[PDB]
Coordinates of C-alpha atoms and ligand atoms in Angstrom, one line a residue:
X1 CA -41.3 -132.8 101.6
X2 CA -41.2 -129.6 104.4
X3 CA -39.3 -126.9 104.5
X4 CA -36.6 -128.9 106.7
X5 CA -33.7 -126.8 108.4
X6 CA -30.6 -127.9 110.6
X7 CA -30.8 -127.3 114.2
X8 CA -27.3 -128.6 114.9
X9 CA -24.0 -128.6 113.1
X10 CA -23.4 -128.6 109.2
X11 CA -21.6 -130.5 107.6
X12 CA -22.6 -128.3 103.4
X13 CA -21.9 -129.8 100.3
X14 CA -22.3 -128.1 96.9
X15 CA -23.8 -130.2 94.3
X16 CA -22.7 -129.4 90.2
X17 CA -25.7 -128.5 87.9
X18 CA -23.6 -130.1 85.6
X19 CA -21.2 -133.1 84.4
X20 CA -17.4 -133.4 83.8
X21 CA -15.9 -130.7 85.4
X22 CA -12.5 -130.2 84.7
X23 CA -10.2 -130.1 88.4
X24 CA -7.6 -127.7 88.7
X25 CA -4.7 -130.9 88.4
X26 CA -6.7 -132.2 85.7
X27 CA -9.3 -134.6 87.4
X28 CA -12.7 -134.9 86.4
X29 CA -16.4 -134.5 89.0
X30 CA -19.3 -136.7 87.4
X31 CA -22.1 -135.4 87.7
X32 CA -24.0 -137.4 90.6
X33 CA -27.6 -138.0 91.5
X34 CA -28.4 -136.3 94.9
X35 CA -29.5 -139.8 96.1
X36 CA -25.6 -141.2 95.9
X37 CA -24.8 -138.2 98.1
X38 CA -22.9 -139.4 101.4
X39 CA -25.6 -138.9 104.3
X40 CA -23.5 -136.8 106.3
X41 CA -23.7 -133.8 103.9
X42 CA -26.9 -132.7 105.8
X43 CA -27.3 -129.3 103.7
X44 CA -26.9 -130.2 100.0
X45 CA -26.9 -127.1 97.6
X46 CA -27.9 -126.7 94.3
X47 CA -25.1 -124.8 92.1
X48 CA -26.2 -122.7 90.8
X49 CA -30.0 -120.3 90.2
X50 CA -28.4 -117.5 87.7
X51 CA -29.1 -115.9 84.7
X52 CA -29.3 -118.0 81.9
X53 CA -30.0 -115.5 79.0
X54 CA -30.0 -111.6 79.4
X55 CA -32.6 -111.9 77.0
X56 CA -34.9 -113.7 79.8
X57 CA -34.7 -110.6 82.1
X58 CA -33.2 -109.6 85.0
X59 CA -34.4 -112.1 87.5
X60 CA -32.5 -115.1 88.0
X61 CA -33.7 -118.8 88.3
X62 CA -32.9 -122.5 88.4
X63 CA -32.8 -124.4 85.2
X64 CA -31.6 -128.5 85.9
X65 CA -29.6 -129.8 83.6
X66 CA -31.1 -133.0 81.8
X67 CA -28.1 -134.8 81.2
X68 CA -27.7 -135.6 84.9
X69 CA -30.4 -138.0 83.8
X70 CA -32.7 -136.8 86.6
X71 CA -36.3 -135.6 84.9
X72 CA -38.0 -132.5 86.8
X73 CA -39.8 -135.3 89.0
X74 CA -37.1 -137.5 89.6
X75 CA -35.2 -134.4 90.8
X76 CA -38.2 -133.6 93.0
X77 CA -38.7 -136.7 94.6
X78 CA -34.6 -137.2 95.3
X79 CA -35.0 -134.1 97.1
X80 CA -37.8 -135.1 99.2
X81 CA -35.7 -138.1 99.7
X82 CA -33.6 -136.2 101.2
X83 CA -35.8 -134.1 103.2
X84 CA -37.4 -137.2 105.0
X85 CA -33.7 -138.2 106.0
X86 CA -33.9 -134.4 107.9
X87 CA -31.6 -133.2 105.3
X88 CA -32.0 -129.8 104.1
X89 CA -31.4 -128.8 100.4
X90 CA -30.5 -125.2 99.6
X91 CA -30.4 -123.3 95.9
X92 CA -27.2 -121.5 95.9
X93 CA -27.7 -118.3 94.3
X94 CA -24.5 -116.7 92.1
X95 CA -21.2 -118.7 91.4
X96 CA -19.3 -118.0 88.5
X97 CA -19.9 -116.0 85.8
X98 CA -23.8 -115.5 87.1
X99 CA -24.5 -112.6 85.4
X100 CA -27.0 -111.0 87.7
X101 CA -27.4 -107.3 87.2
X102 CA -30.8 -106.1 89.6
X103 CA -32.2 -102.8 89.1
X104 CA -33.6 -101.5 92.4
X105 CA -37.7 -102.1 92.3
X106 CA -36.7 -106.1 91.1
X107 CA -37.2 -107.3 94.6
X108 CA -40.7 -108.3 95.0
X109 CA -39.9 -110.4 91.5
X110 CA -36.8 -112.1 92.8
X111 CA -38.7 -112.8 96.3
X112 CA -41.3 -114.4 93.8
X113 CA -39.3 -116.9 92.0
X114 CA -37.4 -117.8 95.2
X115 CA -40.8 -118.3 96.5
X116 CA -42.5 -120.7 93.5
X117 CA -38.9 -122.7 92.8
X118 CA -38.8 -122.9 96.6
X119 CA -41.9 -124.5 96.3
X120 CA -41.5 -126.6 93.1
X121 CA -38.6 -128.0 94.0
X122 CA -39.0 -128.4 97.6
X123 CA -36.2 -126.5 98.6
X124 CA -35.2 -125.5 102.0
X125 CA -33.6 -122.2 101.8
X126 CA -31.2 -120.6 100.0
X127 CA -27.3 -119.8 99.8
X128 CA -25.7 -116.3 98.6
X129 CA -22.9 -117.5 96.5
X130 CA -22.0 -114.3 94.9
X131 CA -18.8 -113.9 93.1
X132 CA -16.5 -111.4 91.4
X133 CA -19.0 -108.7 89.7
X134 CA -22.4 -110.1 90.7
X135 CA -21.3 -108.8 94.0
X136 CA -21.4 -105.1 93.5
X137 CA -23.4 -105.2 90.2
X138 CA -26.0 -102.6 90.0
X139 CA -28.3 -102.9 92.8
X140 CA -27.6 -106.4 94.0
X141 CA -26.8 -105.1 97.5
X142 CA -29.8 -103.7 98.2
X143 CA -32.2 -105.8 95.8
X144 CA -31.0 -109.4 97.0
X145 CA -31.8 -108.8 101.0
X146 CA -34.6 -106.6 100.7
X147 CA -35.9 -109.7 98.6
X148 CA -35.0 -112.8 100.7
X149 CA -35.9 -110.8 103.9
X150 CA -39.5 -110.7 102.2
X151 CA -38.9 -114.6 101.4
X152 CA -38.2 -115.6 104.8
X153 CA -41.2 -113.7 106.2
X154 CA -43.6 -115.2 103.6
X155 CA -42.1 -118.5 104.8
X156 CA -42.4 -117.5 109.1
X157 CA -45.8 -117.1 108.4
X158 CA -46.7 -120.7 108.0
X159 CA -44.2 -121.8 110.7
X160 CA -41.4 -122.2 108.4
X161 CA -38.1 -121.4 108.9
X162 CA -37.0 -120.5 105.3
X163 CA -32.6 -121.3 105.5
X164 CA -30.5 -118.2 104.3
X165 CA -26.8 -118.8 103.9
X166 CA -24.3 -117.2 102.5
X167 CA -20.5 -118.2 100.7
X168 CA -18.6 -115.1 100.7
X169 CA -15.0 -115.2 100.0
X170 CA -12.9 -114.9 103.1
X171 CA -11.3 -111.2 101.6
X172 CA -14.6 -109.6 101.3
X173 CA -15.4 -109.8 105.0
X174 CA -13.6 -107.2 106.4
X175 CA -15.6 -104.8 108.1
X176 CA -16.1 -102.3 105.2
X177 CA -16.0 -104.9 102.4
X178 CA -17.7 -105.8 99.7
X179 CA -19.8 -108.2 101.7
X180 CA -21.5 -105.9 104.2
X181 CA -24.9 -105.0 103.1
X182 CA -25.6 -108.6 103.0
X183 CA -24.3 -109.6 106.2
X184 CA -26.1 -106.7 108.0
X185 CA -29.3 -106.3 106.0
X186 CA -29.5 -109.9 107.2
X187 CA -28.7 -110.3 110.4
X188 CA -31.3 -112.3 112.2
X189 CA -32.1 -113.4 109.1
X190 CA -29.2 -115.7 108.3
X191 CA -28.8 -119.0 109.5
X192 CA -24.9 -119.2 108.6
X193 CA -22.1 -118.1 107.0
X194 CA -20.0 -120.6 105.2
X195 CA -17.2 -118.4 103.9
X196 CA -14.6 -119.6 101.4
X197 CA -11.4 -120.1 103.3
X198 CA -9.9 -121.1 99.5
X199 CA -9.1 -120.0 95.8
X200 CA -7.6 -116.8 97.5
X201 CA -3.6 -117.5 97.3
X202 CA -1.7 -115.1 99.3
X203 CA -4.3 -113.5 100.9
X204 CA -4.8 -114.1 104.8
X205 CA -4.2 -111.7 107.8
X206 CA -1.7 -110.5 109.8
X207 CA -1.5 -111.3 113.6
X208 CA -0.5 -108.4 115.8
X209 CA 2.7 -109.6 117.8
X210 CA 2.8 -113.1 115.4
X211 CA 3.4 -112.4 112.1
X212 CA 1.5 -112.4 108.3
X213 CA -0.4 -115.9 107.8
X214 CA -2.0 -116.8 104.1
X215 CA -4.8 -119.1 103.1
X216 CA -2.2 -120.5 101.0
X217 CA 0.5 -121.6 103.0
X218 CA 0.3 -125.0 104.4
X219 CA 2.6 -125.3 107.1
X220 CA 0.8 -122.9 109.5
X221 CA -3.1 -124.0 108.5
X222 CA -3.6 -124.8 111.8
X223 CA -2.6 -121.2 112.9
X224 CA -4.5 -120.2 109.6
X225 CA -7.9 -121.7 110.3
X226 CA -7.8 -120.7 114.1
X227 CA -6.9 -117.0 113.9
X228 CA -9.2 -116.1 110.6
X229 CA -12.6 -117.6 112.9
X230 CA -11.0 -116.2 115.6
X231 CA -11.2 -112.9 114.2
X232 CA -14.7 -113.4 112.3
X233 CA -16.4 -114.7 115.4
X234 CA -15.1 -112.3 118.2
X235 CA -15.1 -109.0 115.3
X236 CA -11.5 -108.1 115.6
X237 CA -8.7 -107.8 113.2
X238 CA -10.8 -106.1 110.9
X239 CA -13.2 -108.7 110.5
X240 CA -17.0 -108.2 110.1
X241 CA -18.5 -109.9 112.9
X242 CA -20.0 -113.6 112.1
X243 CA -21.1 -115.4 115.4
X244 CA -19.4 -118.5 116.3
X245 CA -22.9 -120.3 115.9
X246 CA -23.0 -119.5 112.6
X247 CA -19.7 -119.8 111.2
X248 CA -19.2 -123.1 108.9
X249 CA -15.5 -123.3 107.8
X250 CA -15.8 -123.8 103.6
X251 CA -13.2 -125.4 102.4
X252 CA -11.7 -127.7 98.6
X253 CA -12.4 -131.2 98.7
X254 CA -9.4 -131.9 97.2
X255 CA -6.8 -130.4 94.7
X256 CA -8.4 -130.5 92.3
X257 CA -11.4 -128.5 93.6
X258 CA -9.8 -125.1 94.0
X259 CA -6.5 -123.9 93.3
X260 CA -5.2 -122.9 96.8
X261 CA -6.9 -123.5 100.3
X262 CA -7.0 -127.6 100.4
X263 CA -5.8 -129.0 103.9
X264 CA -3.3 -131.2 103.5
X265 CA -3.5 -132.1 107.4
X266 CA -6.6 -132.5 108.7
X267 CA -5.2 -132.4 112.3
X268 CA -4.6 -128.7 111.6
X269 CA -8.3 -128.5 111.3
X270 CA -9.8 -130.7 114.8
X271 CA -6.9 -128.5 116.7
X272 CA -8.0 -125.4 115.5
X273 CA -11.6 -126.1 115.5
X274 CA -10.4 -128.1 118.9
X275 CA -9.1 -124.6 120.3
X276 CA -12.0 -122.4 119.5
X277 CA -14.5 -124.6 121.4
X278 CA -11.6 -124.3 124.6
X279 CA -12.0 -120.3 124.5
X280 CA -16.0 -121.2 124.6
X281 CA -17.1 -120.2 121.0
X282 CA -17.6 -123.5 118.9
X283 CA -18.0 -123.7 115.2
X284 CA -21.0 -124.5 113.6
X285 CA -19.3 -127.0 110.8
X286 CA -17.7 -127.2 107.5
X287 CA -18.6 -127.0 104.3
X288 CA -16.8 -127.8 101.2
X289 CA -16.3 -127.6 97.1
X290 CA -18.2 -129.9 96.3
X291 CA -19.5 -133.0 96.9
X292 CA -18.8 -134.2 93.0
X293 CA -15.2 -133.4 94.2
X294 CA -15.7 -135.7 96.7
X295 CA -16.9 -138.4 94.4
X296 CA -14.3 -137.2 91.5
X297 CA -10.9 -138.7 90.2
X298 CA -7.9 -137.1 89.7
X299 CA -5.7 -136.5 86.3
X300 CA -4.3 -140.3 86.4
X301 CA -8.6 -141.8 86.8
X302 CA -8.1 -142.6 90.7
X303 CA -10.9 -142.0 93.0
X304 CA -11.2 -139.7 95.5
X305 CA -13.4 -141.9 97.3
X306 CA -15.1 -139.6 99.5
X307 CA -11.8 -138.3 101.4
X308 CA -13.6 -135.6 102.5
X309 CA -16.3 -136.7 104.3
X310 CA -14.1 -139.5 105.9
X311 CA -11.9 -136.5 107.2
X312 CA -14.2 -134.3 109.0
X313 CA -17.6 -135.8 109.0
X314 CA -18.0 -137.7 112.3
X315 CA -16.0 -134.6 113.7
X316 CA -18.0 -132.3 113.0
X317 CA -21.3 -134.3 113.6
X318 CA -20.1 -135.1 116.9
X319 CA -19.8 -132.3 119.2
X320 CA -22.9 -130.5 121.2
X321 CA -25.4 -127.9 119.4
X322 CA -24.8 -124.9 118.7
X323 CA -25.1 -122.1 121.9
X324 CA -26.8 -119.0 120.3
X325 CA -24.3 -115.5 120.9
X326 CA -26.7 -113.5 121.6
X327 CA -25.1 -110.3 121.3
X328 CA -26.5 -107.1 120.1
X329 CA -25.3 -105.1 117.3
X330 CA -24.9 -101.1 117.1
X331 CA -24.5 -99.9 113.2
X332 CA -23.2 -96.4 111.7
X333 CA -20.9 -95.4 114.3
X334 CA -17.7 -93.7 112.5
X335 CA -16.0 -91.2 113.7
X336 CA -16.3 -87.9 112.9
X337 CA -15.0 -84.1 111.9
X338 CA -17.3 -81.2 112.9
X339 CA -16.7 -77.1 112.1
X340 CA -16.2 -75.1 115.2
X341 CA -20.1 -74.2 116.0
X342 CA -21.7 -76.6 113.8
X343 CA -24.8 -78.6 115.4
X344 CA -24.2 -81.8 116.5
X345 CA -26.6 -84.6 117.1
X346 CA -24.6 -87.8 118.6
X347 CA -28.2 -90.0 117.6
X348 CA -28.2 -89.0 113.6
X349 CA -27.6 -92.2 111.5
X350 CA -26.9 -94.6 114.3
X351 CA -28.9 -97.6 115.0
X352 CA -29.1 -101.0 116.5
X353 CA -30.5 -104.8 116.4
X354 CA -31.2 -107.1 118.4
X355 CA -29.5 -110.4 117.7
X356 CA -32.7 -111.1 115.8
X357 CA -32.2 -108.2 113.9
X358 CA -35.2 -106.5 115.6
X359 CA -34.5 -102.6 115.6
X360 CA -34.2 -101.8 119.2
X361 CA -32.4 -98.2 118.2
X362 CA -34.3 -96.8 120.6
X363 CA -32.8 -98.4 123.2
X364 CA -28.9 -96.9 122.4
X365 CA -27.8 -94.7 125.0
X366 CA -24.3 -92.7 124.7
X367 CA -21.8 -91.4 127.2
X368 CA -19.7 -88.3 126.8
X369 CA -20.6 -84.8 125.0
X370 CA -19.4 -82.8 122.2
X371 CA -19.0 -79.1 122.7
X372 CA -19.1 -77.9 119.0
X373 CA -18.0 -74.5 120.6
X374 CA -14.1 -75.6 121.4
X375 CA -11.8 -77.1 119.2
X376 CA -10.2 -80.4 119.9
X377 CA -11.5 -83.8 120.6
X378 CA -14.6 -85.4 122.3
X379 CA -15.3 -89.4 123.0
X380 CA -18.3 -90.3 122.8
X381 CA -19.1 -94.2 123.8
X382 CA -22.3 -95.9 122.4
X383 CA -24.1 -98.8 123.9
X384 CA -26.9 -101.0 124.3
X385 CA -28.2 -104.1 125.9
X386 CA -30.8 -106.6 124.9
X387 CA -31.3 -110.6 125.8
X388 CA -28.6 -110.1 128.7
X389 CA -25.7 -109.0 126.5
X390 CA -24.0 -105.6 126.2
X391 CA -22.2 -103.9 123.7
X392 CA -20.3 -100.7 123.5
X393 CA -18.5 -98.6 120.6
X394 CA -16.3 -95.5 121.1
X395 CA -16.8 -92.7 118.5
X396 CA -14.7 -89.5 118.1
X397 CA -15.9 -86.3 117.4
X398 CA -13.1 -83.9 116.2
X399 CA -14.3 -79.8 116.4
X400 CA -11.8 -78.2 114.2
X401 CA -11.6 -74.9 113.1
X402 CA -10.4 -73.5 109.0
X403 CA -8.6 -70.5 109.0
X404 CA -9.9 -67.6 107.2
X405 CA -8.5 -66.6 103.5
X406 CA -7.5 -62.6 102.2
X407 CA -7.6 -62.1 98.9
X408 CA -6.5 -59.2 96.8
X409 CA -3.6 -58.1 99.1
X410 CA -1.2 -58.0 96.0
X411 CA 1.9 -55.8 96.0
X412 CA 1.1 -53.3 93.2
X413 CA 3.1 -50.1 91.1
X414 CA 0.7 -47.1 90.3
X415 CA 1.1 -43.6 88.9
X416 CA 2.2 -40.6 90.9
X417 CA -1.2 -38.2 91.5
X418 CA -3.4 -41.3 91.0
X419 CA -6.2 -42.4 93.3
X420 CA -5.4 -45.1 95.7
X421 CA -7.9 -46.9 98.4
X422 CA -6.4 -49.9 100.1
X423 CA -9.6 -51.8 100.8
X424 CA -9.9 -51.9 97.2
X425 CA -10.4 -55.0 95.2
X426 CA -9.6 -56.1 98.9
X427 CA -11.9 -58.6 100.8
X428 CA -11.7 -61.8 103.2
X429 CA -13.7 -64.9 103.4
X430 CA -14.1 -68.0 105.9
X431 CA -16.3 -70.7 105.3
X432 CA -18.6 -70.5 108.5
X433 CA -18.5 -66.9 109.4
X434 CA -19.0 -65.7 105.5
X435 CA -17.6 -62.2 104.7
X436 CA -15.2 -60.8 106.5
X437 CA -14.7 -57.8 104.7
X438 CA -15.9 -55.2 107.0
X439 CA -13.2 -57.0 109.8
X440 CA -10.4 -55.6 108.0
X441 CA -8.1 -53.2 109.1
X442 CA -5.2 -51.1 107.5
X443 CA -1.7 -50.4 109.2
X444 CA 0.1 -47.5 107.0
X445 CA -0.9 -45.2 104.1
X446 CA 0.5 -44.5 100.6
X447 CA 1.3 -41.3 99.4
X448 CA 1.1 -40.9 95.9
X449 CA 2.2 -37.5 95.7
X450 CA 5.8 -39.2 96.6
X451 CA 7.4 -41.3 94.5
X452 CA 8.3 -44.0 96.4
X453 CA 7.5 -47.9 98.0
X454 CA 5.0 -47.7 100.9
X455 CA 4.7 -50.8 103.2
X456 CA 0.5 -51.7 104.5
X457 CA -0.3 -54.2 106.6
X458 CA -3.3 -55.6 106.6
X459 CA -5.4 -57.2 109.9
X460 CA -8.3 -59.3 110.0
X461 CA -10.0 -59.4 113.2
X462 CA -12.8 -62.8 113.6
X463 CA -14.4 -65.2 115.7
X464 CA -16.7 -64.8 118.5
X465 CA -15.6 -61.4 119.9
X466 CA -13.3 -60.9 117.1
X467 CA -10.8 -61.8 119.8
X468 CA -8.9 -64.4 116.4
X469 CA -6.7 -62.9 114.2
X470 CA -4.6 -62.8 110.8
X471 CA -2.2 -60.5 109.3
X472 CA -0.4 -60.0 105.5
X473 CA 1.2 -57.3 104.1
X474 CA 1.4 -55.4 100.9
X475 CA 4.0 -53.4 98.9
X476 CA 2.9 -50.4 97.2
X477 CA 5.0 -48.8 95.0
X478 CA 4.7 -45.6 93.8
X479 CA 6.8 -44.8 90.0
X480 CA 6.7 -41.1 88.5
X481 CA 5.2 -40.6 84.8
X482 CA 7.9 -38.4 83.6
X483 CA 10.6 -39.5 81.2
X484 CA 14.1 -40.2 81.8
X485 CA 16.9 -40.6 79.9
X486 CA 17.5 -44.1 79.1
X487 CA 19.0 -46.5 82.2
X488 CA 22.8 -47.0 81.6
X489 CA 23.5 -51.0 80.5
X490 CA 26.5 -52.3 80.4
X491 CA 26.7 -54.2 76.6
X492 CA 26.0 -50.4 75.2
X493 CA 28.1 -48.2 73.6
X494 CA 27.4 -44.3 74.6
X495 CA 29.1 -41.4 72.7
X496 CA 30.3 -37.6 74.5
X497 CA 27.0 -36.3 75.5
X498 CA 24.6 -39.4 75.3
X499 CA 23.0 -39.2 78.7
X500 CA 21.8 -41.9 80.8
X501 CA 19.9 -43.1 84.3
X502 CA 21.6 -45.5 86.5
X503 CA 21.9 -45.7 90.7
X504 CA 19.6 -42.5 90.5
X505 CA 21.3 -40.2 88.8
X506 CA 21.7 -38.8 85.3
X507 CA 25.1 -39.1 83.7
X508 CA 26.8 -37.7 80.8
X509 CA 29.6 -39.8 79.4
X510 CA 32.4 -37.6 78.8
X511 CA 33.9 -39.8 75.5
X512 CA 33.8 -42.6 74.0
X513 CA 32.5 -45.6 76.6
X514 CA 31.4 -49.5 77.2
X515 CA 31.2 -51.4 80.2
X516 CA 31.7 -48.4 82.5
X517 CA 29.1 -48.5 85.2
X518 CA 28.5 -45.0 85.8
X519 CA 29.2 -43.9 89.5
X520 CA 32.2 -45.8 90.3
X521 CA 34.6 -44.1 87.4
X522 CA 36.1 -41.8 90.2
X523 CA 36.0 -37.9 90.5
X524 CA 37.7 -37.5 86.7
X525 CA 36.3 -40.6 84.8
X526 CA 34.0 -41.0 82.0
X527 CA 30.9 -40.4 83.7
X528 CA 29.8 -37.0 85.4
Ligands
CL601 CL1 -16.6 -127.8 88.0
NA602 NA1 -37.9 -129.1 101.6
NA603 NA1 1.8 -126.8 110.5
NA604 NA1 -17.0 -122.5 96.0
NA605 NA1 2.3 -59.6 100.5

């Protein structure tokens, strides 16, 4: 069959490349044929194109499994089956343990095998289901969109609108996640986001003014479900952006389809989605782990008889298409610190999309100025407009200003007669302005003629009009070369005549002494 996308809601189901999966409360998911597949899973992906064998190279790819009892044609033809039903049929890329590890220059061969099992298989698009280290690994992040934007061009060329999705994790979607490259490489290019809102446990997001709420706690999933696609839709509460036209709730089948994140009552769900389409922004549909789940039994052989689907099919079927947000995006805006007379350019590394992802950079204007030549703080507020929407982003710029630094201003002892120069081993530095040494100035001089302690102070003068300034001081002593008798301690033992130093002076013990501290043994004491 075509290349067959969904113009209206989703309801996605995963389908297992694989039999006898083991549930997380011991159940069992058959592998199914995609013909038994309940009709109202209108996107139906393939889990999962990965790497098989590292020996195989770098580039993933799809490999069915033959004990699904499906040949390479009868796979084929069930999927054109579904195709004529206008039923679309995505290869989800990742899950699990998917080993993909791209080296930057793998694009063009990862667009190719998208392209020929695309082809071969008749598939419709396909879904990022990256997990854990596949994520991050290597290049992925900048190999994997380069390549599927180059998939969905090959495709627009011959009038085909090749599906992108994507399955992050709810966690990785904050705004600086691990998520982001994707999400904005491809924006314009995606047709949807069906995050996991599961598998996460205590995980969720806290609600100024309301309190903490978890993925995992089932007596507030209503307020769960509404405030997490409240947040990803509108771009608050530290949420990347995902418009509410293309955000598909993902969600277990059952318990035994994911640990945490099944929902127990789906009234929780029709309120919440109920509520989103009240504040005008109406979700584009659920998708769910998996639809073997559906079809699975749990530990004691029971069906679950397609629970899922009965829950939130017809809902989700039956509300109006989806009303395109076309909003603009800006990108690169962070705010910033900037040295006192640095050059500033408020254009440098910021850019914008259209909600087609056409760069309309060009198009940004900016209010406020920074002057780089004062300290303190400057708001600057970005914006642009395209397709009769608006948006704006404030920026602060922060001038600040780094003290200069003295160094050798060290109290020091030297000889009497000897040659002293304060500037010395003495210079100044600051980070902007360079050397400073010629800017410092010297309060007080040493005279090392005279014994004695001799007290500099040092200035440094800077800035424009060396009108800033910094001070430290220094102690220079000044000690005679000539010998003394010995200084007076107090454990010794001096004999009539032993002289000694002490509080100035030089004493001569008058008989036999310890522990007398000479001085303070009176006008006919020991010491004289
Ligand atoms: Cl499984
Ligand atoms: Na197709
Ligand atoms: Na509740
Ligand atoms: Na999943
Ligand atoms: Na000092």
């Amino acid at each position: 069959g075509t290349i067959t996308s969904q113009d209206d809601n989703v309801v996605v189901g995963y389908w297992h490349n694989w039999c006898d999966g083991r549930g997380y409360q011991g159940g069992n998911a058959p592998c199914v044929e995609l013909k038994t597949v309940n009709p109202q899973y209108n996107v139906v992906n393939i889990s999962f194109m990965k790497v098989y064998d590292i020996a195989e190279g770098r580039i993933p790819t799809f490999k069915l499994d033959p004990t699904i009892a499906l040949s390479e044609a009868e796979f084929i033809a069930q999927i054109d089956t579904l195709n004529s039903q206008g039923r679309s049929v995505l290869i989800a890329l990742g899950g699990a343990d998917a080993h993909i590890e791209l080296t930057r220059g793998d694009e063009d061969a990862l667009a190719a095998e998208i392209i020929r099992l695309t082809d071969l298989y008749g598939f419709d698009g396909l879904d990022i289901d990256l997990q854990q280290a596949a994520i991050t690994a290597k290049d992925n992040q900048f190999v994997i969109p380069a390549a599927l934007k180059m998939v969905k061009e090959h495709y627009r060329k011959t009038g085909d609108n090749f599906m992108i999705t994507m399955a992050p994790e709810f966690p990785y979607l904050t705004a600086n996640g691990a998520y982001t490259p994707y999400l904005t490489e491809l924006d314009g290019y995606y047709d949807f986001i069906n995050p996991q809102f599961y598998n996460q446990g205590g995980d969720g997001l806290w609600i100024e003014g309301v309190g903490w709420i978890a993925q995992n706690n089932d007596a507030l999933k209503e307020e769960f479900i509404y405030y997490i696609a409240d947040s990803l839709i509108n771009g608050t509460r530290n949420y990347h952006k995902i418009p509410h036209d293309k955000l598909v709730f993902g969600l277990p089948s059952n318990i035994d389809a994911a640990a945490t994140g099944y929902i127990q009552d789906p009234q929780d769900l029709y309120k919440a989605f109920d509520r989103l389409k009240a504040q005008g922004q109406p979700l584009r549909g659920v998708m769910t782990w998996s639809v073997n789940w559906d079809m699975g039994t749990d530990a004691a052989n029971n069906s679950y008889n397609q629970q899922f689907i009965k829950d939130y099919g017809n809902f989700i079927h039956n509300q109006l298409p989806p009303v395109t947000d076309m909003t603009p995006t800006l990108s690169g805006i962070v705010d910033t610190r900037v040295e006192l007379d640095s050059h500033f350019d408020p254009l440098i590394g910021i850019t914008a999309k259209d909600y087609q992802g056409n760069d309309i950079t060009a198009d940004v204007t900016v209010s406020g100025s920074v002057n780089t030549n004062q300290v303190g703080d400057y708001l600057l507020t970005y914006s642009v407009s395209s397709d009769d929407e608006t948006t704006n982003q404030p920026r602060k710029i922060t001038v600040y200003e780094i003290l200069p630094a003295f160094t050798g201003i060290t109290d020091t002892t030297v000889v009497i007669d000897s040659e002293f120069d304060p500037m010395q081993g003495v210079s100044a530095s600051h980070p902007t302005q360079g050397d400073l040494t010629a800017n410092i100035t010297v309060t007080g001089e040493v005279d090392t003629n005279v014994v004695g302690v001799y007290e500099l102070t040092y200035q440094l003068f800077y800035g424009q009009d060396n009108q800033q300034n910094m001070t430290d001081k220094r102690i220079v002593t000044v000690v005679t070369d000539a010998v003394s008798d010995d200084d007076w301690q107090v454990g010794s033992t001096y004999v009539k005549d032993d002289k000694v130093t002490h509080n100035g002076a030089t004493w001569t013990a008058q008989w036999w002494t310890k522990g007398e501290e000479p001085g303070t043994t009176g006008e006919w004491g020991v010491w004289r």
